[PDB]
Ligand binder design. Structure first.
Ligand code: NA
Lengths: 6, 6
């Protein structure tokens, strides 16, 4: 699991 | 825009 910003 | 974690 990982982060995204959009 | 916003942060997501998956
Ligand atoms: Na990250």
């Amino acid at each position: 699991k990982d982060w995204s910003f959009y």
